[PDB]
Amino acid sequence: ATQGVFTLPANTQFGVTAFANSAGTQTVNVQVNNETVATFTGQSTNNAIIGSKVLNSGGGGKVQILVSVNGRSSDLVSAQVILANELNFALVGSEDSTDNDYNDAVVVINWPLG
Amino acid sequence: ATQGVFTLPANTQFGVTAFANSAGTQTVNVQVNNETVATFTGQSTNNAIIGSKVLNSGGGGKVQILVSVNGRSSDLVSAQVILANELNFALVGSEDSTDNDYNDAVVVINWPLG
Amino acid sequence: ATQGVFTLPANTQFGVTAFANSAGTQTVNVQVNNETVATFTGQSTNNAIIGSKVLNSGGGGKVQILVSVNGRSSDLVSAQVILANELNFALVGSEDSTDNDYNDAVVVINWPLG
Amino acid sequence: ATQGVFTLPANTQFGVTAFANSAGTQTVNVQVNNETVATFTGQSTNNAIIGSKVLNSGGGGKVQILVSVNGRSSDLVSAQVILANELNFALVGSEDSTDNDYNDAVVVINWPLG
Ligand SMILES: [Ca+2]
Ligand SMILES: [Ca+2]
Ligand SMILES: [Ca+2]
Ligand SMILES: [Ca+2]
Ligand SMILES: [Ca+2]
Ligand SMILES: [Ca+2]
Ligand SMILES: [Ca+2]
Ligand SMILES: [Ca+2]
């Protein structure tokens, strides 16, 4: 299945935060309605935050996360979870090698804000 | 139900990150096997990160999040989600008032690291 | 927090299924836009299905689960999870006594159908 | 990523329930520790239950779901969610064709029982 794609409500503010856990330098691209609106880059084997931003989901509400290491696409896993019928998490893990920890870059998207 | 309590694997490294979305100043306490091992305080209505740390789950693996505003306990909601049978997220929302957005402090715990 | 309340897309077919794991006879009440549309009753300590129905979410899309045993309200826990940005589960556990297993009646709501 | 594989606690009773939403006859295979312990075969475009069984997770706790239609593997998606730090759902969707609804066979694994 396609992974890392989420439909948000339209024109809604959301937070996107990325953590790194790999020897490889991670590149996280955030696309909103098929336009790149953020790129995070960093390296950590200790969960360092390599980016955190507030973005808007725009008309289509389509938010896609892509992760690469040195231009090679990582394999993704994802889900969305909603708590108390209001608090949304869109969760992505990525795998840049063979160990299947899926934590090489971890991306957490949350809404609503404010 | 009790919320904000999670059983991790023993002696395991995990990340904890807290976000704020309220007029009220948020205090997030992190307890590992009933000892307070981190405390984050901060105020934001725009999802600012008010703390991020790497901790060890210790022998019991018990991780509890408590949130308060002005010394008053916030109501919590929580769940744990596992992706690819390996990547774990323990998720907490908290409500300090009456609107029920449960985002006033948002806490994300992730493991494994490295 | 209020639990057992979910917002579905409007005018959408959904499935609701209830399982029992208790000595007590479970009564599961299903409301759609604040009107009772189903009631499932049954007893099992071995996960027997006590009801499965297809319903429509109507204009408001509001679905609520309540659980009681001999007229006494059970404590609820719930969450919604979305897979592949399309497959939805709305999940309820309920606790009729003291052991905190939350499985006394378990309710799974799924959409889309067809 | 591999999907439809879950680690349960050892020697634990669990329920497995399959729903069908396709024109195609669905064959759901359940393995516990790499041995077939159940096979559900049925057809429905309206969420009918094509199998429900109680099984034991055995020493390894490994549970795998595979879905096929006329001998051809469906694409799977999955996740595990834990409520109240005790109530577990392991969730599978499967796609037998092109529409990406992932509901053609839907598998819900729950524990604990009793
Ligand atoms: Ca890896
Ligand atoms: Ca890693
Ligand atoms: Ca609030
Ligand atoms: Ca708020
Ligand atoms: Ca109970
Ligand atoms: Ca029970
Ligand atoms: Ca399909
Ligand atoms: Ca279908």
Numbering used by the authors:
A (entry chain A), B (entry chain B), C (entry chain D), D (entry chain C): 1 to 114
The authors write:
Two extracellular carbohydrate-binding proteins, LecA (PA-IL) and LecB (PA-IIL), are virulence factors and necessary for adhesion and biofilm formation. LecA binds to d-galactose; LecB from the strain PAO1 shows high binding affinities for l-fucose and reduced binding to d-mannose and their glycoconjugates. Despite high sequence variations, biophysical characterization uncovered that both variants possess very similar glycan binding preferences, although very surprisingly LecBPA14 generally displays 2- to 7-fold higher affinities.
LecBPA14 was cloned, recombinantly expressed and purified from E. coli. In analogy to LecBPAO1,41 the 1.70 Å resolution native structure of LecBPA14 shows the lectin as homotetramer with the four carbohydrate recognition domains (CRD) containing two Ca2+-ions each located on the vertices of a pseudotetrahedron. A direct binding of G114 to one Ca2+-ion from the neighboring monomer stabilizes the tetrameric structure of the lectin, which was confirmed in solution by dynamic light scattering experiments. Notably, the structural alignment of LecBPA14 and LecBPAO1 revealed that all amino acid variations in LecBPA14 are located exclusively on the outer surface of the tetramer. Mutations at the interfaces of the tetramer subunits are not present, and thus the oligomerization of LecB is conserved. The crystal structure of LecBPA14 and comparison to its PAO1 homolog revealed the localization of all mutated amino acids on the outer surface of the LecB tetramer some of which are located in or near the carbohydrate binding site.
